[PDB]
Design an enzyme around this catalytic site. Sequence first.
Site, mmCIF file in Angstrom:
data_model
loop_
_atom_site.group_PDB
_atom_site.id
_atom_site.type_symbol
_atom_site.label_atom_id
_atom_site.label_comp_id
_atom_site.label_asym_id
_atom_site.label_seq_id
_atom_site.Cartn_x
_atom_site.Cartn_y
_atom_site.Cartn_z
ATOM 1 N N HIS A 41 9.114 -7.340 -2.830
ATOM 2 C CA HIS A 41 8.980 -8.374 -1.806
ATOM 3 C C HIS A 41 8.386 -9.690 -2.346
ATOM 4 O O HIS A 41 8.294 -10.661 -1.591
ATOM 5 C CB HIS A 41 8.271 -7.880 -0.556
ATOM 6 C CG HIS A 41 6.799 -7.716 -0.690
ATOM 7 N ND1 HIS A 41 6.221 -6.467 -0.690
ATOM 8 C CD2 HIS A 41 5.826 -8.655 -0.664
ATOM 9 C CE1 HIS A 41 4.908 -6.675 -0.752
ATOM 10 N NE2 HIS A 41 4.621 -7.980 -0.724
ATOM 11 N N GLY A 143 -2.021 -11.247 -0.730
ATOM 12 C CA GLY A 143 -2.090 -11.575 -2.147
ATOM 13 C C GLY A 143 -2.509 -10.396 -3.012
ATOM 14 O O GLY A 143 -2.449 -10.483 -4.242
ATOM 15 N N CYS A 145 -1.005 -7.550 -3.054
ATOM 16 C CA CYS A 145 0.145 -6.743 -3.423
ATOM 17 C C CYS A 145 0.367 -6.690 -4.902
ATOM 18 O O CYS A 145 0.082 -7.662 -5.602
ATOM 19 C CB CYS A 145 1.394 -7.179 -2.680
ATOM 20 S SG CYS A 145 1.151 -7.267 -0.901
HETATM 21 C C1 LIG Z 1 -1.402 -9.202 4.570
HETATM 22 C C2 LIG Z 1 -1.783 -8.074 3.647
HETATM 23 C C3 LIG Z 1 -3.021 -7.454 3.763
HETATM 24 C C4 LIG Z 1 -3.287 -6.318 3.024
HETATM 25 N N1 LIG Z 1 -2.410 -5.770 2.174
HETATM 26 C C5 LIG Z 1 -1.244 -6.404 2.002
HETATM 27 C C6 LIG Z 1 -0.883 -7.543 2.717
HETATM 28 N N2 LIG Z 1 0.408 -8.099 2.576
HETATM 29 C C7 LIG Z 1 1.477 -7.474 3.110
HETATM 30 O O1 LIG Z 1 1.381 -6.545 3.907
HETATM 31 C C8 LIG Z 1 2.823 -7.978 2.628
HETATM 32 C C9 LIG Z 1 3.714 -8.302 3.803
HETATM 33 C C10 LIG Z 1 4.524 -7.324 4.368
HETATM 34 C C11 LIG Z 1 5.248 -7.616 5.507
HETATM 35 CL CL1 LIG Z 1 6.228 -6.371 6.228
HETATM 36 C C12 LIG Z 1 5.206 -8.863 6.100
HETATM 37 C C13 LIG Z 1 4.431 -9.858 5.512
HETATM 38 N N3 LIG Z 1 4.410 -11.136 6.048
HETATM 39 C C14 LIG Z 1 3.682 -12.269 5.510
HETATM 40 C C15 LIG Z 1 2.398 -12.638 6.277
HETATM 41 C C16 LIG Z 1 2.754 -13.093 7.697
HETATM 42 C C17 LIG Z 1 1.592 -13.717 5.548
HETATM 43 C C18 LIG Z 1 1.563 -11.436 6.377
HETATM 44 N N4 LIG Z 1 0.954 -10.478 6.435
HETATM 45 C C19 LIG Z 1 3.683 -9.568 4.374
#
Ligand SMILES: Cc1ccncc1NC(=O)Cc1cc(Cl)cc(NCC(C)(C)C#N)c1
Lengths: 304, 304
Positions: A41, A143, A145
């Site tokens: 991603h 960030g 990831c």
């Molecule tokens: C935010 C976070 C927190 C902890 N571990 C990981 C993460 N990041 C993720 O989960 C990656 C991810 C996956 C999906 Cl399915 C969507 C998104 N969208 C982007 C945004 C709206 C900025 C957010 N959230 C981002």
Amino acid sequence: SGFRKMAFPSGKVEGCMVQVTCGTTTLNGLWLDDVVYCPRHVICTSEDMLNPNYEDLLIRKSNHNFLVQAGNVQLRVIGHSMQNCVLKLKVDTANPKTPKYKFVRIQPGQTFSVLACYNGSPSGVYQCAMRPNFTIKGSFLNGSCGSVGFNIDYDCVSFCYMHHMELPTGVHAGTDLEGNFYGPFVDRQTAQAAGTDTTITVNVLAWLYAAVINGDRWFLNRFTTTLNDFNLVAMKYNYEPLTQDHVDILGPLSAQTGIAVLDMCASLKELLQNGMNGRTILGSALLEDEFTPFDVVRQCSGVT
Amino acid sequence: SGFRKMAFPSGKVEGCMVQVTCGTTTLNGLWLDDVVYCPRHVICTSEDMLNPNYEDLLIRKSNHNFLVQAGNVQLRVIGHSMQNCVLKLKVDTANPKTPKYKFVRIQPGQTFSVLACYNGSPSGVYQCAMRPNFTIKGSFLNGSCGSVGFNIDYDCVSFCYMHHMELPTGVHAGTDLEGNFYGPFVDRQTAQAAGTDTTITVNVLAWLYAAVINGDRWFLNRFTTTLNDFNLVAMKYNYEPLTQDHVDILGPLSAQTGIAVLDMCASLKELLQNGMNGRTILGSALLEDEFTPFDVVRQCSGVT
Ligand SMILES: Cc1ccncc1NC(=O)Cc1cc(Cl)cc(NCC(C)(C)C#N)c1
Ligand SMILES: Cc1ccncc1NC(=O)Cc1cc(Cl)cc(NCC(C)(C)C#N)c1
């Protein structure tokens, strides 16, 4: 004496962390030999995450669209491929700090250390377990990831997890280093509810043996039980069933303490039924399940 | 989201660990520039520990009696001196992996990471706090002496602790890197009982702010209190007094969450009086006090 939630020393893994940027998305990568591994991603915009077709999105990217930085120096990308949910970026330089390593896929209940990173830089290290519902309860922000989970056996790092996402419920999901998710999760912004997060019984028993070894003995009772009787109670309390394989794995701790596994099961049965009554075991007011029997042996024997 | 007991990445400190042997005693040393620091009790036999005169015992040792091994290579000792309870062994080679560093003496309530070592080799990393009675609750076995505690600020390692001993009660005592013990402890096998291990109030409040930030909000009540009223309750529950300096330190967390510090004090007062009622906060059934306000900000913002 003393018993702590202990992570593996992270140096060998810190030497593998890099930053990967594709367009406007930046995350972490893992640089081993001449390959950088990262969540696929990285190619997505936030808008793409709603309904991504990774093969189609990947067609629009070339090697020069993946920016890999190790420390403050850029690595040259000479190939890229997608393997399940990870990208493998071939670089022209082998990581000089590549440790001896393996890629392993762990089972629920197994513990590992996570080196949480941002922008290819380490922020911290913690210990966790693959939950029985295939989530992890980590500490990750946007960030993070591409941060990885691992175990070490002397000088060999076994990588078992790469962080991909946070579920709508605040728990975490990711893959092994072959890019296969743990559990049924997908790298898409869609409804993904987790199953029952049951307690890892064999790990609780290991930790009660650690408590006895470290002198916290108040919970030891005068009872015994059978696997079938214990499991009737475990089921009622959302604990995983204990098998004869789990009893066998606890044999070294049973031998060290002289407490039969089924006697410890009877002490755990009483703790579930009676509660803690405001008391603590190893400084916890709940029964800890993120120490495996091997972790207890390792920590109590000082393995390096 | 998520909140973990997180240690600093240990790589920079792993690069400093060496084995020091004197006669039949082996422990860990910390190699920074051309000096190896280690507990002075490396010169003692177990029999010497009952009533050691370190100056007299040290007279019987020469530079060649201190064997320092870094990895599988021997370092040449060209000088030795005792500074309080540590020995400083001058070696002929500067540690090529010496990070930017400082020696700091921490106050009770401050947290730090420990890299537990045996035979100069890292076994694990965990996070702990200097208790208000100047002990630490670590995980250390015989041979762990000389393992160090530290904090990191970007690329500077601030060493704050060197492990020396386990008290008869199973808690740990050690020194700063100038060799001065924390608390009243002495490196002798004598009666040394610890004082009251009170709860670090300002850290509990920080962790309740972390709980709110991470969505665990059930404990927030409709009350407020004053510092004097709160402290009457804190005293009753063996919590440290909260000062206006602590309120000021919690200002960034109060601003982030919009919860006044005294309102959070009132929620903590109710938790002390009512108990948890079988509920958990951030997966704990007890109030956690080994996260400082800076730790909460650091972890919740992803500092690297
Ligand atoms: C935010 C976070 C927190 C902890 N571990 C990981 C993460 N990041 C993720 O989960 C990656 C991810 C996956 C999906 Cl399915 C969507 C998104 N969208 C982007 C945004 C709206 C900025 C957010 N959230 C981002
Ligand atoms: C044993 C241990 C465990 C955890 N952390 C540290 C340590 N080691 C120590 O405390 C160092 C120490 C200090 C004193 Cl005052 C006496 C001794 N005697 C030697 C022996 C009988 C083998 C023991 N114990 C050794």
